[PDB]
Amino acid sequence: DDGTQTLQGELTLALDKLAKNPSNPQLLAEYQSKLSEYTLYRNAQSNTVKVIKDVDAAILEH
Ligand code: NA
Numbered sequence: 001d002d003g004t005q006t007l008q009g010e011l012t013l014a015l016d017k018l019a020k021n022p023s024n025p026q027l028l029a030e031y032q033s034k035l036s037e038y039t040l041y042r043n044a045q046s047n048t049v050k051v052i053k054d055v056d057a058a059i060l061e062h
Pocket of ligand 1: 037
């Protein structure tokens with residue numbers, strides 16, 4: 001049950017709904033939101049490393 005694989009499945013289904021009814025602005029917004037959610041997921045991974053670097057910086061300043 002991989003997370004990024006699941007998010008991609010949700011993205012595919014959102015694209016599918018939009019593809020069938022492209023004049024529905026709500027389906028467009030939902031696809032956009034899902035796509036952003038995927039990018040936020042990647043930003044969160046680099047954010048953890050950034051936190052660790054900050055922790056190390058604090059450790060050095062004793
Ligand atoms: Na979600």
